[PDB]
C-alpha cells in the first residue's frame, strides 16, 4: 500500500542477489496499476528461470501429463522414460472422475517404462513396441494410449511417432505420442501446449468425416477444467440447469469419445484459458467454433458468466438463467451473510499457476476480502494483460517468484491470509499465517459455481479464523 | 604409478590402430597395459585380441539386465603380451546413446577395481566425433592424466587437433589432465613433420613422433594384428617402439592454447 | 444445492439426486462406456489365477511401481547435513517434485533448489547454469555447504560434476574453501535408496579423502552411525536415545531429524540442527562405523572399509527381537560399554508383550513392500511374532538380497508359505492378494487402491492395508513413529495385533448375525 | 465339522449352514421368541426421541454406569508404594474382581489380598480376619507396608479399622513398627476416584501427621506430584520426564508404573518400583504439592493445605496446549528452574502438528465420557484443536465440576452446541448418539456395544468409537499411551484425525460410487 513504498519494498528484496539475477528478476515485480492495458509495459513473463533460486515451477511433463492428458479416464497414459516422474505425480492432482479403476478408467495409476541404463544406451522403442502389446493384453477396455515423452526419451531420439503410428494401425488402436520431454520450454507452460497439439493431430479429427452425432443449437463443450475436487461438475450442473446440453469436458472425468465429439458442439467455454486456449483456437479455424472466456469462482463472476454464456443462444436460454440465478440467489446469500461478516476486510496473497491468480479475485471480494498481491508460476502477458484490471492499485505482482522473494514480500505486507501450493503451505504456516492450498484446495473443494462457493467461503473462515493461529508463542516467552 | 592415458584427434586419422601398435611395444618392453576402447563400433582391441570372441561391457550388460550383475572378468581380456582389453560397446549406429555407454562402461571399470592390478599404463581409445559429454569422459579426474592427439599434415586433422584442444580446456583447468602431445600419423605431405612441429608450438605441446604412412600397418590389421606382432623387424615396427619409448620416457603435460581459425590458415599458406 | 448450515463437499455433495441424474446423462450420453456387465466380467478376469500368469509374464510394462529414483535420496541425504542446501543439476521438474513428494509425508517445508537447465543446456552442457546456480544459491539461501546431485538429463550427457564445479571456483562464482560435495544420481540406476548411498558418499569423500594422513582409527573414541535413506523421525531419534543411554560416544552422519521437524513458533527456519562438516572430517578418527540399512549402503561400505581402514560389522538393520539384540552387543564389543539395565528392561517389556498378543498374532498371513532393509526386518519381526509372511514385494531388491531374504524365511517354520518377489511391482502384488489371499496387507499408501480393488470383489475378499513404510499421504503425522529396536518393535506389534482385532470386531459387528463374538474382552 | 488345515473358532464356525439351521430350530422350538418385525419395530423406537424422554427421566434404574467403586481406586493408588501389598478388609469375591479387572486392561499380574470375611465375620466384625490376615500377608508375601482400604460390608457394618489394626500390632500379630496405613473406601459413596483419593490421604497422614514439628516447607528443594487415578503409563512417564528435563526436583507421590509393567524375564516380580517410604515422610519438606487431578483430589488437597502447609497451586489437569503451559510455568516459578529450549520446542512441534491437522478436525462432533478430570482436559483441547465437544458425560461428575466445565464450553465459540451430563449413564448416552448424531464417540470399551447399536439402524447412522480412557478389553496395549502434557496432546490429536481419516477412506472406498473422493494424499 503506496506506490512509492511497494517499489521500495521490490528494490530492497533485489539487493541479495548478484547482478544477473538482480537485472533479471526486476523485470518480473511490478506495482499494478488497473489503468494499464499492456502489460508488458510493467512486466516480463513466460522466461527462463534463474538458476539456484528455488523456483516454485515444474517441466513440460508436467504440464502435458499431468495436467492435460493425465485426467482423461478411458486412456491409459505412459510415463515413458525412468520411474521417477510417474511415481511423484501419480494420483498427486485431484483431477475427479467416475470409473472402474484398473478396468475401464486409470487415472490414478502409473503406467511406465521404468528405463533402466540399457534402455538409455540400446533405445527404448522395442521396449515401448512391446510395452504396449502388454497393455493390450492386461487392460483390453482401454479406449487409448498415451506415451508422455520424460528428458531421456527427447534425448536420444526415440522414435516415439514410428512406434506409435505401427502398433496403432497393428491393434486398431488410437496411440499418442507426446514429446513433452521436461527441458522443453521454461515451465508447465510449454507442455500445455504440447499437449493440445498432440490431441489436434491424433485425436481431434477422428470424425471429421462421420455424421452420426446428432448435434442440437444448445451443445457446447467445458474447455480448460479439470474437475478438481468435483470442480467441473458443479459447473456443468450449472450449464445443463439452463438448458444448455454439455458434450465435452476437457479433460477433468473426461472420456476420449467426448474429445472426438467435441467439433460438433455450438460453442466452445473455455475456464483455462493458459492451458486450452490453443486448441480452441485451433477449433474456431478449422471448425468455424467460437469460444468464450468464463469464470465460475463466486456468485459474481458466475452470475456474470451464466448471462454472458446465454446471451450467445436464445431467449428461452437466457429465461432459464435468470430462473437458475434465482435458484440460487438465497443460497450464495445465505452463505454471504454467515461468512461475509468473519472475513470482511481481510488481505490475502496469492501465488499459482495460470489461471487462479486472476481468476479466484471475484470470489474473495464476495467475502469482502482484499487480495493485495497475486502471480503466477507460468503465465504470460496476455494472462497479466487480464489481471492488471482485475487487481486494486499498488497492489504487488510477481512472476515466477523464488522462495526468497516470496517470504520476504509475506513478512512486509503482513497478509491475513496465504493462498498457494503444497511447497509453499508449511512455510507460512510455521510463520503463523494461515494458508490455503489454492491447487489442491486442501483436499476439499468443490469451489467452482454456486455449490462451490459455499465450500470456499466454509473453508476461508475455518482457516483464518481457526483457534490454532494463536497458539503460536509460547506466554513464558 | 599407473599412467593413464587417452587417445583423441580427427575421425580415421589413425587413433586405433596408432593406439594398439604403441601398446603392442609397451608390452613387448615388459610393461603391464589395459586398453579401454570407448567406441560403440569396438574395434579398439581387435588387434590386440584377435583370437576369440569378444563381449562389450553393454552387451554384457543388456544379456544381463544391468551392469550390477556384471562381472570384471567376463568383459576383460588378455591378448598379445599379456596387454588386457576391454571394450565399452554401445548401440549399432543411429539408435539409443553411445555417450551415456562409455559413462557406463568406465564407471564399471573404475567400481569393479580395474584400476587394481599393478598396471603401468591405461590407455583410452575414443572415437573420432567427441559429440558429448560421455565421449569426454576418459580424462575427467581419477581417469586420462595424459591426452595425446593423433593429426596429420592435411587440414581438416590440424582443426580437429584445436578444436579437441578447444574441449580439453575445461577439464584441464578443473583438474590434472594435460596434452601430452601430438602424435604426427603421415600423409605424406610435404614437409609434413616441420608443420606439425610448427603447430605444437602454437598450442604448446610437442610433436612427440613422426609416424611415417606404411602400407604395412594396413596389411597387419587386414590380419587383425598390430606390426608388432605380424613383423617385428619391419621398419615400421621400428618407428612403434621408438614412439614408445618416447611415451615412457614422456615428462612433457601441458594447458594447450588453441588458436583462431585464423592462424591455422596463416600456419598452412605460411608452408 | 447446499444448505448453509451443514454444507457437503465433494463427497457427499455429488450423491444428491441432481448430481448423480448429471453424472448418468453425462455417461450415457457421451462417454461411450463399456457396458456394465462387461465392467464386471473384466474385473472378475482380473482376480484370476488366468489373469495373474499373464500378469507375472510382463517384460517391457511396469505398472504402480514401488520405488521412486535417485535424487529424492539424494536430496534427503543433503537435508541431514548443517545448513547445506540440497542442490539438484539438471531439470527444475525434478526438484519441484523431489519437494512436493516429501511434503506430502513429512507436512513440513522441503528445501532444494535447481539450475534449472533448459533446452539449449542439454545441447551445449550446463557449466553455465552450475556457475550462476551456485553463485546465487549461496548469495540467497546463505548455505554453509551445497550437496550436487543431478537429474537424468544431466547423466545422459554426461555434464562432468567435479569439472562444472571446480570451473566455478576458478572462475569466481563461489569461495574456493566454500564446501560444494556431489555425485552422481542417475534415476535409470537402481532407485531412490541407491541415491542416498551415493550422495553419502560423496559428501564423505568430499571431508576424508585427501586428509587420512593424520587419522588414526579409535583415536576419537566415538562410532559413527550411518542411517540410509529414513523416512520416521523416530528412527533417528531411537539410535541416538539408545547410545546415549549406554554412554556411547556416537556420530550420526546424515541427521534430518531436526529440520524435518521445526517448531511453529512464529518463524521459518529454512536450516536445523544435522551432521557437522567438523562432524565428517572428524569421522575417520572414530572407533568404527556402523550402517543401518547396510543393502542401500554398498557403495559407502567400500569407501569406509577402504579408505577409513574401519572393520564395518556384518549386522543386518536393527529391526525386531534378535537383530535389535545383536546391534546392541555389538555397539556394546565396539565401545567396551556394557548393555545398561535401562535397556535390558525394555527388552523384557518388548517380550512381555510378545508373549501378551501372541495369540492373535499367531498364523496370521501378511503381504508386504518396501525398501530391502525395511522389508527384511519387517520379514524377520513377523517370523519371531509367529505370524507368516505370505508375499513379500520388493520392487528395488536385487538377486543377493532376494536369497539372503529366502535363508531367513527357511529358518523358521513360520516362514514355508513365503514366496519373495524382486522387480515386481504393485499391480503384480494386486493379483497375489486376490488368487492367494492374505490377511492384511503391509505397505506405503499406494496400498490402499488394492484394498479398493478387493473390497470390489465382495468383503470376504478384502484385505485391509496397514500403513507403514514410505509415503504415506493419505494419514497425518506417522512420520513421526518408530519402527527400529525394542521401541519400533513395541510400535509395530502394536500396530498389527490392534490391526486385526479391529477387523475382526468390524466382522462381528453385526447384530444378531455375528455379535455372538464382539467380545468386550480380548 | 472342521477342516483340519484351516479350523474356525467360534467365529467363523457357527456360521457353517448345519450351525444356523440348528440355531433356527432351537429359536423356533423352545425359545418363545417376540417375532422379528416386533424386535424392530422396539428397535426403531429405542433410537427415538420420545424413548430418550423416558430414558431420561429415570430416578431408579441404572444402565451401563460408566464408573466403577472406591477400593479399585484405592488398591491402585497402593500399588504406587514401594513393596506395597494392598489389601482389602471385607469380602474376597471383590478382590478378584479388582484384580481381574485390572489385569484385563494392563495385561500385567495385580497383586492384592482379602481378609475373606464370611457370613460370621459380617455379624461379629471382622477383627479376628484383621489380625490373622496381617500375619499371614506380612509371612506370605513379604511386604514393606501392607495398605487396607475396605468392601462395602465393613462399611456397612462399622468395621473400626484403626481399632483392629492397632489391636493387631497390641497382640503381636505385626510388628509395631510395620507400617499399616488405612483408609475407610464406602463403595456407595462416590466412585473409584474417591477410593484413591481416600486412600491417598490415609498413607500421607500415616507417615506425616504425628511428625510435623521438624518440617520445614521448602528445605529439600523439591516439588510433590500427586498423579490421582492413573492408568495410561505414559502420564506417569511424562511428568517424570518433563520435570527431569527442567531439572526440577520431585517426588511423585504414588507411582505404580514399574509394578505395572515388569519384564518378562523368566521371573514374576510381585513388587517393583514405587514411591518409597522415606519420600511420604519427606514429602512436607517439599517447596509446594502439585494435584494432577485435583477434581478427584479434594481430601487430599485439605490435608496438604492443612497439615503440610503447601500452597497448592490451581492448576487444572495437564491435558491440551494452554493447560501443559500453565502447569510448566507454574512449576518454573515454583522451583526457579526456567523452562528450557527442549519444552519450548516440544510446545511448538505440537502446534505445528495443529496447523498441519486442522482443516480435518474443524467441526467435528464428538460425545464423550470418562472420569472428570480426564473428560475437562478432553473437552479443554477438542475446543483447541476446532472441534465441538457435543455430548459430555461424566456418570461420577458432581455439580461444580459440570458448572466449570460449562464456563470451558461457554469460552469458545465451539462449545455452542455442548451440553454436559452428570449422573448419567451409557445407556442415556446411547440416546443421544441416536438423536443428535455425532461423528465420534472418545471412550472406553464400552462404547463398543453404542457403535454395535448404531451401525444396526444402518451404516449412515453408525458412530465409530475412539479408545481412550479406561478401561480398555479390546485392544492390546494402548495402557502404554500416554494423555498428558505435549506428548499426550500429540498423541491424542494423530488418533483424532487418523480416526477422521480411516472413517473417511471407509466412506469412499466403494468402486465406481463413492471412490472419486478416495484421495491418495490427505
Ligand atoms: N601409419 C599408417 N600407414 C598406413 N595406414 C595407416 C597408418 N595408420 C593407420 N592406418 C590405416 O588407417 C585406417 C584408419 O585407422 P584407425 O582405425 O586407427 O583410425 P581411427 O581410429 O582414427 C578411425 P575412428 O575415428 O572411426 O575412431 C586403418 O585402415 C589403418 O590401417
Ligand atoms: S490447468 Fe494449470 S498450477 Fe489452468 S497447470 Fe496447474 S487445475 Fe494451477 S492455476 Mo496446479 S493454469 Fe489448472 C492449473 Fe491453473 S495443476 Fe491446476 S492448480 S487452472
Ligand atoms: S524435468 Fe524424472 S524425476 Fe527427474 S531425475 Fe528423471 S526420472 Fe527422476 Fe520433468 S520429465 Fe521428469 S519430472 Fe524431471 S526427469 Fe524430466
Ligand atoms: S463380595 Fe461390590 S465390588 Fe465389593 S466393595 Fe461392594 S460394590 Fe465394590 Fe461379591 S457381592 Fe459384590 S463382588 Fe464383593 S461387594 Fe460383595
Ligand atoms: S549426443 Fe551423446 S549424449 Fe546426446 S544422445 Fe547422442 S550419444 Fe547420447
Ligand atoms: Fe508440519
Ligand atoms: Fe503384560
Ligand atoms: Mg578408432
Known amino acids: 500500500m503506496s506506490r512509492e513504498e511497494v517499489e521500495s519494498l521490490i528494490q530492497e528484496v533485489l539487493e541479495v542477489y548478484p547482478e544477473k539475477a538482480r537485472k533479471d528478476r526486476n523485470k518480473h515485480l511490478a506495482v499494478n496499476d488497473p489503468a494499464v492495458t499492456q502489460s508488458k509495459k510493467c512486466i516480463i513473463s513466460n522466461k527462463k528461470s534463474q538458476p539456484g533460486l528455488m523456483t516454485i515451477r515444474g517441466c513440460a511433463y508436467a504440464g502435458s501429463k499431468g495436467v492435460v492428458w493425465g485426467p482423461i479416464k478411458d486412456m491409459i497414459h505412459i510415463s515413458h522414460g525412468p520411474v521417477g516422474c510417474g511415481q511423484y505425480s501419480r494420483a498427486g492432482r485431484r483431477n475427479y472422475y467416475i470409473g472402474t479403476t484398473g478396468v475401464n478408467a486409470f487415472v490414478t495409476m502409473n503406467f511406465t517404462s521404468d528405463f533402466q541404463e540399457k534402455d538409455i544406451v540400446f533405445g527404448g522403442d522395442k521396449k515401448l513396441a512391446k510395452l504396449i502389446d502388454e497393455v493390450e493384453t492386461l487392460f483390453p477396455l482401454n479406449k487409448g494410449i498415451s506415451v508422455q515423452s520424460e528428458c531421456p526419451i527427447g534425448l536420444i531420439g526415440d522414435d516415439i511417432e514410428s512406434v506409435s503410428k505401427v502398433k496403432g494401425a497393428e491393434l486398431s488402436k488410437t496411440i499418442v505420442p507426446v514429446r513433452c520431454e521436461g527441458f522443453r520450454g521454461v515451465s508447465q507452460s510449454l507442455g500445455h501446449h504440447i499437449a493440445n497439439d498432440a490431441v489436434r493431430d491424433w485425436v481431434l479429427g477422428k470424425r471429421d468425416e462421420d455424421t452420426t452425432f446428432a448435434s442440437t443449437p444448445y451443445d457446447v463443450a467445458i474447455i480448460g477444467d479439470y474437475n478438481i475436487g468435483g470442480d467441473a461438475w458443479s459447473s456443468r450442473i450449472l450449464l445443463e440447469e439452463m438448458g444448455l446440453r454439455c458434450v465435452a469436458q476437457w479433460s477433468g472425468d473426461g472420456s476420449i469419445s467426448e474429445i472426438e465429439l467435441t467439433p460438433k458442439v455450438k460453442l466452445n467455454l473455455v475456464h483455462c484459458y493458459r492451458s486450452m486456449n490453443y486448441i480452441s483456437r485451433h477449433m474456431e479455424e478449422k471448425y468455424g467454433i467460437p469460444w468464450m472466456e468464463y469464470n465460475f469462482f463466486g456468485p459474481t463472476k458466475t452470475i456474470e458468466s451464466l448471462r454472458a454464456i446465454a446471451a450467445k443462444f436464445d431467449e428461452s436460454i437466457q429465461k432459464k438463467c435468470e430462473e437458475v440465478i434465482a435458484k440460487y440467489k438465497p443460497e450464495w446469500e445465505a452463505v454471504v451473510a454467515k461468512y461475509r461478516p468473519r472475513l470482511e476486510g481481510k488481505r490475502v496473497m496469492l501465488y499459482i499457476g495460470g489461471l487462479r491468480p486472476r481468476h479466484v479475485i471475484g470470489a474473495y471480494e464476495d467475502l469482502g476480502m482484499e487480495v493485495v498481491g497475486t502471480g503466477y508460476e507460468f503465465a504470460h502477458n496476455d494472462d497479466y494483460d487480464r489481471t492488471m484490471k482485475e487487481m486494486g492499485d499498488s497492489t504487488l505482482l510477481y512472476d515466477d517468484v523464488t522462495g526468497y522473494e516470496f517470504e520476504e514480500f509475506v513478512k512486509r505486507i503482513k497478509p491475513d491470509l496465504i493462498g498457494s501450493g503444497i511447497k509453499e503451505k508449511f512455510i507460512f504456516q510455521k510463520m503463523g499465517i494461515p494458508f490455503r492450498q489454492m491447487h489442491s484446495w486442501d483436499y476439499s473443494g468443490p469451489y467452482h459455481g454456486f455449490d462451490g462457493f459455499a465450500i470456499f467461503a466454509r473453508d476461508m473462515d475455518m482457516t483464518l479464523n481457526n483457534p490454532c493461529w494463536k497458539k503460536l508463542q509460547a506466554p513464558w516467552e | 604409478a599407473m599412467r593413464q592415458c587417452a587417445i583423441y584427434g580427427k575421425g580415421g586419422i589413425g587413433k586405433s590402430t596408432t593406439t594398439q601398435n604403441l601398446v603392442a611395444a609397451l608390452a613387448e618392453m615388459g610393461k603391464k597395459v589395459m586398453i579401454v576402447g570407448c567406441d560403440p563400433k569396438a574395434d579398439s582391441t581387435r588387434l590386440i585380441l584377435h583370437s576369440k570372441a569378444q563381449n562389450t561391457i553393454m552387451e554384457m550388460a543388456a544379456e544381463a539386465g544391468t551392469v550390477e550383475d556384471l562381472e570384471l572378468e567376463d568383459v576383460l581380456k588378455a591378448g598379445y603380451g599379456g596387454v588386457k582389453c576391454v571394450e565399452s560397446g554401445g548401440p549399432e549406429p543411429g539408435v539409443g546413446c553411445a555417450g551415456r555407454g562409455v559413462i557406463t562402461a568406465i564407471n564399471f571399470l573404475e567400481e569393479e577395481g580395474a584400476y587394481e592390478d599393478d598396471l603401468d599404463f591405461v590407455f583410452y581409445d575414443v572415437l573420432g566425433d567427441v559429440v558429448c559429454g560421455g565421449f569426454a569422459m576418459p580424462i575427467r579426474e581419477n581417469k586420462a592424466q595424459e591426452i595425446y592427439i593423433v593429426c596429420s599434415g592435411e587440414m581438416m586433422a590440424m582443426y580437429a587437433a584445436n578444436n579437441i584442444s578447444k574441449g580439453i580446456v575445461k577439464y584441464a583447468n578443473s583438474g590434472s589432465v594435460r596434452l601430452g602431445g601430438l602424435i604426427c600419423n603421415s600423409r605424406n605431405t610435404d614437409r609434413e613433420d616441420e608443420l606439425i612441429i610448427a603447430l605444437a608450438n602454437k598450442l604448446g605441446t610437442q610433436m612427440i613422433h613422426f609416424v611415417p604412412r606404411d602400407n604395412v600397418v594396413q596389411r597387419a590389421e587386414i590380419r587383425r594384428m598390430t606390426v608388432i606382432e605380424y613383423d617385428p623387424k619391419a621398419k615400421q615396427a621400428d618407428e612403434y617402439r621408438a614412439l614408445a619409448r618416447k611415451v615412457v620416457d614422456n615428462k612433457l603435460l601441458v594447458i594447450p592454447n588453441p588458436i583462431t581459425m585464423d592462424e591455422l590458415e596463416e600456419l598452412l599458406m605460411e608452408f | ?522
Not at chain 3, 286 to 311: I, R, Y
Not at chain 3, 408 to 432: C, E, F, M, Q
Not at chain 3, 483 to 490: C, F, I, R, S, V
Open chain 3, 1 to 522: 444445492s447446499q444448505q448453509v448450515d451443514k454444507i457437503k463437499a465433494s463427497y457427499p455433495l455429488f450423491l444428491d439426486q441432481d448430481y448423480k441424474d448429471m453424472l448418468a446423462k453425462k455417461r450415457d450420453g457421451f462417454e461411450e462406456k463399456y457396458p456394465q456387465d462387461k465392467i464386471d466380467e473384466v474385473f472378475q478376469w482380473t482376480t484370476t489365477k488366468e489373469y495373474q500368469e499373464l500378469n507375472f509374464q510382463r517384460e517391457a510394462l511396469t505398472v504402480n511401481p514401488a520405488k521412486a529414483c535417485q535424487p529424492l535420496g539424494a536430496v534427503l541425504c543433503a537435508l541431514g547435513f548443517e545448513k547445506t542446501m540440497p542442490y539438484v543439476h539438471g531439470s527444475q521438474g525434478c526438484v519441484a517434485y523431489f519437494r512436493s513428494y516429501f511434503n506430502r509425508h513429512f507436512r513440513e517445508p522441503v528445501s532444494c533448489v535447481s539450475d534449472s537447465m533448459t533446452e539449449d543446456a542439454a545441447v551445449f552442457g550446463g557449466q553455465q547454469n552450475m556457475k550462476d546456480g551456485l553463485q546465487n544459491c549461496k548469495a540467497t539461501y546463505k548455505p554453509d555447504m551445497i550437496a550436487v546431485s543431478t537429474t537424468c538429463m544431466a547423466e545422459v550427457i554426461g555434464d562432468d560434476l567435479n569439472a562444472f564445479i571446480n570451473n566455478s571456483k576458478k572462475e569466481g562464482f563461489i569461495p574456493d574453501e566454500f564446501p560444494v560435495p556431489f555425485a552422481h544420481t542417475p534415476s535409470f540406476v537402481g532407485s531412490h535408496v541407491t541415491g542416498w548411498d551415493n550422495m553419502f558418499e560423496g559428501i564423505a569423500r568430499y571431508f576424508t579423502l585427501k586428509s587420512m594422513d593424520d587419522k588414526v582409527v579409535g583415536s576419537n573414541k566415538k562410532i559413527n552411525i550411518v542411517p540410509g535413506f529414513e523416512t520416521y523421525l523416530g528412527n533417528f531419534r531411537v539410535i541416538k536415545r539408545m547410545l546415549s543411554e549406554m554412554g556411547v560416544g556416537y556420530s550420526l552422519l546424515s541427521d534430518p531429524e531436526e529440520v524435518l521437524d521445526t517448531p511453529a513458533d512464529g518463524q521459518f527456519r529454512m536450516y536445523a540442527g544435522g551432521t557437522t562438516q567438523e562432524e565428517m572430517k572428524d569421522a575417520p578418527n572414530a572407533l568404527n562405523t556402523v550402517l543401518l540399512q547396510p543393502w542401500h549402503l554398498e557403495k559407502t561400505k567400500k569407501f569406509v572399509e577402504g579408505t577409513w581402514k574401519h572393520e564395518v560389522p556384518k549386522l543386518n538393520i536393527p529391526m525386531g527381537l534378535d537383530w535389535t539384540d545383536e546391534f546392541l552387543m555389538k555397539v556394546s564389543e565396539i565401545s567396551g560399554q556394557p548393555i545398561p539395565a535401562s535397556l535390558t528392561k525394555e527388552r523384557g517389556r518388548l517380550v512381555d508383550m510378545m508373549t501378551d498378543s501372541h495369540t492373535w498374532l499367531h498364523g496370521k498371513r501378511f503381504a508386504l513392500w518396501g525398501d530391502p532393509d525395511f522389508v527384511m526386518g519387517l520379514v524377520k519381526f513377523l517370523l519371531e511374532l509367529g505370524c507368516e509372511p505370505v508375499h513379500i514385494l520388493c520392487h528395488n531388491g536385487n538377486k543377493r538380497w532376494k536369497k539372503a531374504v529366502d535363508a531367513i524365511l527357511a529358518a523358521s517354520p513360520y516362514g514355508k508359505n513365503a514366496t519373495v518377489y524382486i522387480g515386481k511391482d504393485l499391480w503384480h502384488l494386486r493379483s497375489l492378494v486376490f488368487t492367494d489371499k492374505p490377511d492384511f496387507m503391509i505397505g506405503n499408501s499406494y496400498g490402499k487402491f488394492i484394498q479398493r480393488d478387493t473390497l470390489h470383489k465382495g468383503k470376504e475378499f478384502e484385505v485391509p492395508l496397514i500403513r507403514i513404510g514410505f509415503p504415506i499421504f493419505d494419514r497425518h503425522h506417522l512420520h513421526r513413529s518408530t519402527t527400529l529396536g525394542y521401541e519400533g518393535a513395541m510400535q509395530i506389534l502394536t500396530t498389527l495385533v490392534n490391526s486385526i482385532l479391529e477387523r475382526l470386531d468390524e466382522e462381528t459387528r453385526g447384530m444378531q448375525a455375528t455379535d455372538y463374538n464382539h467380545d468386550l474382552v480380548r
